[PDB]
Amino acid sequence: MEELKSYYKRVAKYYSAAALLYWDMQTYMPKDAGPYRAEVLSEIGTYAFKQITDDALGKLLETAQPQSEIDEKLVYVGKKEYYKYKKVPPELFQEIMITSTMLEQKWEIAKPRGDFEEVRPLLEKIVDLSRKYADILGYEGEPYNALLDLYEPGMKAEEVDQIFSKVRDFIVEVLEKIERLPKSEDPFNREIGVDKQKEFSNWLLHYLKYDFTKGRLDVSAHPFTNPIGLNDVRITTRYIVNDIRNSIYSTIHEFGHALYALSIPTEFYGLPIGSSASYGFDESQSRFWENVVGRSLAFWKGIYSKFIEIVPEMRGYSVEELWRAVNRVQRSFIRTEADEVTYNLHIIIRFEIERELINGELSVKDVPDKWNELYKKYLGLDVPNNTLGCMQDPHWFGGNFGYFPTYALGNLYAAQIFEKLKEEINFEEVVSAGNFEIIKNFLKEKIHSKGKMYEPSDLIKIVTGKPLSYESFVRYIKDKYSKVYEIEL
Amino acid sequence: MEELKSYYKRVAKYYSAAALLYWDMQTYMPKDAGPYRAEVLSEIGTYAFKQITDDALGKLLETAQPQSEIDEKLVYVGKKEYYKYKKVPPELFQEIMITSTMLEQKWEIAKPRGDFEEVRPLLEKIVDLSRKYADILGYEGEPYNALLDLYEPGMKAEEVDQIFSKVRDFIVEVLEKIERLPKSEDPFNREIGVDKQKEFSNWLLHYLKYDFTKGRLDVSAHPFTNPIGLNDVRITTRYIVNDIRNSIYSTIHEFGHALYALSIPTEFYGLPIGSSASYGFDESQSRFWENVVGRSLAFWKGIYSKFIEIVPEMRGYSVEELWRAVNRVQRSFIRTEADEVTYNLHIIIRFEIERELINGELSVKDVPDKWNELYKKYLGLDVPNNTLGCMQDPHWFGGNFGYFPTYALGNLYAAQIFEKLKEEINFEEVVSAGNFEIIKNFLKEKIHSKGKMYEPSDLIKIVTGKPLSYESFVRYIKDKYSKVYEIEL
């Protein structure tokens, strides 16, 4: 039904405006403009929501007569989203929405001082609303499964728990072998001017063939990807003078997200089937490019001579030394700084906590002690204060629960996708040659072209023939880190 | 009525989004994003219009009971705007809106080739709609008076004609005395790197105390000022390597607009009384700062040492030489490049043409010949082609008629405002000292604080005690250009 399509395409225009408003907020917006910008965003978002849970859309959904298979998926997906969100009493939406912004802005102030008490009351409030929200969305097995479903449709906390446990056991085994070894000096531990870093990030984006007719690179406090409109998908990075790896891998990570957004069929734009399949799947794409491609020796062989030219200071290092040095493993307090071996331990910890929070088995008051205890259990670290501890990430302070686990699933999806890719393609030759269109074409045909037509579990089977599990990841880490650290396992 | 205020403040949020969408379009937007951005903008604009011509607002306007004098003005102004635009059949709005964008985009292509025929059909169409638009808005004296009223409320074409004639006569007299003199070499006719130009524009903005917590400077193809939101008023400039005066005076011109927007009372934000009084009044503010302040010897005395430091190449010039050189008079094809003596001749020519167009006394087909004839009559120039001729400006190709004359009125207002300011203030001492808050305070108390509470004719009397006329301008030009060129008159 053309009429159904138009209704969605009209609402998407308001989403586009909201997306630009968010992008500008993080990049160019003047300081004092913040509070009003927040009000504009809230207004536009709430209007878009009204439109998307309105009777006229339900009426269109119930009257449309699909002609093709794609039309069927559209209504199917359209219906499921509509009836789920119809159930949301506009009171609860606005009550969460304002509580979020207020928790968000309070967190900014309290975080440098690890002052949990300044954010505690709003956090225990947002968790309460979430639990009510979860009740009136309905759930199988666990209240938490309701919220998890919003980010990873069809995924259950019990399966996540089973995969996480196996993943954890393998990671402690690996960590223990790696930790025995003396570390080498870090060749990237040195000052490289921002201008040189920008030059290299821009070179990388051209080498990867980022479409600068349909996006751009800017800086923000926290690197992200923002699909603003048709042919407008923007990415940000951050330049840390004494660790060029931050800008390099942020840029490539965001390229990964951007490529996904740009490669979804144009005809899907603005439609319910027009986004990525899930947060896990979107993160599988950023991680694929950032880590599987970006931290591979094959990738480095191709960028080495250009890097060396731009950064003559590091001429004295071999490509193999540089490759190993972007793969340094280290238990650290900060999730966003974690290597691909320790990273998932950070997600497990957050998974355990937010699940118990939403299932009413843990209080907000006990969060700091619980966080610290789990960092001690899984990462063997003594969290000194809350800044490095439980207030380090914004997610919870924006009210997002069920989001965190999808970062880990993203790592798992990426490894399994990569194992499949390797059956059809000489990955090392392709990547060291810089011939990425071969890889892009595989990802488009297998993944990007499907948009949100399928739930992730179905999508992973279509792509790889198997449900998601940890074996691909285990194999990926065993093989790679054995080569990195020159030891068995 | 708080309820009336809220309704407007809600619509203003959509205006805010539209404003950001326009700003980004001109600054950061990737090339291929254009067509969809145009669709988002159109959608949001049309929704905002619906809201502002909707029965619920009429009902609020007719039921509100003003408590204070400001409330009265609000409803008064609110009513006049509402009933005027209610009369607009949504067909006519969208029909003009799309015709505009299509005329706009065609013009871009045809302009480099002066191909009038590629734009002719859409232009004759947009003029026809305009004439219908003018009929169903209603008018006194002239159909053109309807459109003129949208940019300069209460102004009639007959008064504009009378002022323009006197202004023209004085200008040819002045031009003739100036043209007899041999020109000196132009000290600014040299390459100055963009980095140095940026440094100076940023210095200027700090010297003028642009509030960078509530705005920012960027570049675009065509310098402008965009009030995006509360505490968010942005300006753009353009750097021409071989004429630093372009960036200097663009920056200061836009500062002038920005200051006006920022100084309207916060309580008026989002309300009908919350904008500038008219286009003429807004342009009087940009011109005041750009020319009356910016091209004065007094201003130059204060910026001289800083300029000289930034541009050591021009150390060999005296401040008086630099001052004269930003005041070089020259008949030229291009309106945006015209000095303050010849500039208004460009506006007269456009006034005469669009008035006759809208009053049905001139066809679109005859525009090129008419333009060329009037450039010959008033500026003594032989227009070689349409690129330098009638297709040089975008206004008509965006459907804006009645806009052009307000540029000239802006010059007239500025001179009269300046004559009044001089009765209360030692302008030269204040300006050469860099003590601009004295001037800002006068402009705020007299002008900016009034927003759109008053029609321009009433506002100019309040500010200066007289209706608008050309005498202040005549006096301003006689006195200044006599000093610049060292001759009588």
Ligand SMILES: [Co+2]
């Ligand atoms: Co990501």
Ligand SMILES: [Co+2]
């Ligand atoms: Co202006």
